[PDB]
Amino acid sequence: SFELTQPPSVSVSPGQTASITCSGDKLGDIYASWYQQKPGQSPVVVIFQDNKRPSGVPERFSGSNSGNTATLTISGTQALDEADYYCQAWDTSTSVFGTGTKVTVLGQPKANPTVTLFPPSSEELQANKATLVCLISDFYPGAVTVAWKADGSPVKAGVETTKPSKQSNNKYAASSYLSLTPEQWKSHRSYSCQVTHEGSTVEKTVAPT
């Protein structure tokens, strides 16, 4: 499989030009296509054969395939152009999609997340389990990384983190859960849920007491 690499995320303000790139060695020798997928929906073709538009596609969408790189341009980007965009190319008879780009059309000021961290309940400890619950809310735009620490040392095992989901207020929420044993829980000074968003980090800490 030849791999078509796209930048994972692009932000654009309404009215501005959104540039989405797609790179790969076999690209440029071959024709590139672009598919748009709005939330909850099937993908839709917007560009084919590098720079052609299907009849129904608006003119503000355009494409170019210079060298090893294909680019989708969205002029005068509208809020409804907010979607995941995927490039595609045919390797002989094998179809390959690019890794995808999330295009956020900024509709709202940046909002850092409200993070709430709960320790294990006594009832759960009585059942010989321990879950740390880290809840992330009201963040925009809708991309976060979660990291767990034990006494400020990274913890990668026992971590189950959701992908962000859009709240009714158009901000995003997410959850992360850390599984521990009662013994692990009682044998450390502190546990921390550390949430990074737009280059700001929020840390909440809980301790056995």
């Binding site: 499989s1 071959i30 024709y31 296509s33 598919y35 997928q37 099937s42 993908p43 839709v44 073709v45 084919f48 054969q49 052609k52 299907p54 995941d84 995927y86 595609q88 045919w90 008879s93 094998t94 179809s95 390959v96 999609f97 690019g98 890794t99 995808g100 709430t116 709960f118 309940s121 009832e123 759960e124 059942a127 879950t131 619950v133 809840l135 809310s137 189950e160 983190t161 959701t162 992908k163 989901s165 929420a173 997410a174 959850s175 992360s176 859960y177």
Partner: protein, 217 residues
């Protein structure tokens, strides 16, 4: 009138099998190659398989080469995908898409797509949750952890529907185990704590599970 409709999606145990179909309307099915594209929850598009208009030339992604078989009955305007020895990694919405040609030519594209059909490959079995009370200026965060349940969904109310404005019920995580865990939090007065009673009402209809959990500090 031009539409593709996928069928056959469902929950399947790993190692099991599933047959997917795709019914075409509004065009001459035989005149066009049809392909299957899948997408795992929260992840990117992944090409699975493709078939020429006549059904002669069949093409498969490396990830599915042995386990999957694509075929078509043009008389029934239907495409099929036979999936065997399913893996958890095959969990995805499966879309059928129609090419603009009879075959997979250079500058050909998928002009029409269906709404898709959902395949879940999980070893999990129906199981109701264990509900645990999540406790700690002017406000206090109180919560209910709804743990280790299958399948979706779960409904959470507070004080039987009396508190809703300051309530945030988060989407579930799917754990490695195949079980779901969800959490609901409510914002309340910190002064009222120890005076007021806060109860989350958890309902998991698939397991006929109702739990009323009193949350105290």
């Amino acid at each position: 009138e031009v539409q593709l409709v996928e069928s056959g999606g469902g929950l399947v145990q790993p190692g099991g099998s599933l047959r997917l179909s795709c019914a075409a309307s509004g065009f001459t099915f035989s005149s066009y190659a049809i392909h299957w594209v899948r997408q795992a929850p929260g992840k990117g598009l992944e090409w699975v398989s493709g078939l020429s208009g006549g059904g002669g030339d069949t093409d498969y992604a490396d990830s599915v080469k042995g386990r999957l078989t694509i075929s078509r009955d043009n008389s029934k305007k239907t495409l099929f995908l036979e999936m065997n020895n399913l893996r958890p990694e095959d969990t995805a919405i499966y879309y059928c898409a129609k090419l603009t040609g009879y075959g997979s030519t250079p500058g050909s594209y998928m002009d029409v797509w269906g709404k898709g059909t959902t395949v879940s490959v999980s070893s999990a079995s129906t199981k109701g949750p264990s509900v645990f009370p999540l406790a700690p200026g002017g406000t206090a965060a109180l919560g209910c952890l709804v743990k280790d349940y299958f399948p979706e969904p779960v409904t959470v109310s507070w004080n039987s529907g009396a508190l809703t404005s300051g309530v945030h019920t988060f989407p579930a995580v799917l754990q490695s185990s195949g079980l779901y865990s969800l959490s609901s939090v409510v914002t309340v007065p910190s002064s009222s704590l120890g005076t007021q009673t806060y109860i989350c009402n958890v309902n998991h209809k698939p397991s006929n599970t109702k739990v009323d959990k009193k949350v105290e500090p």
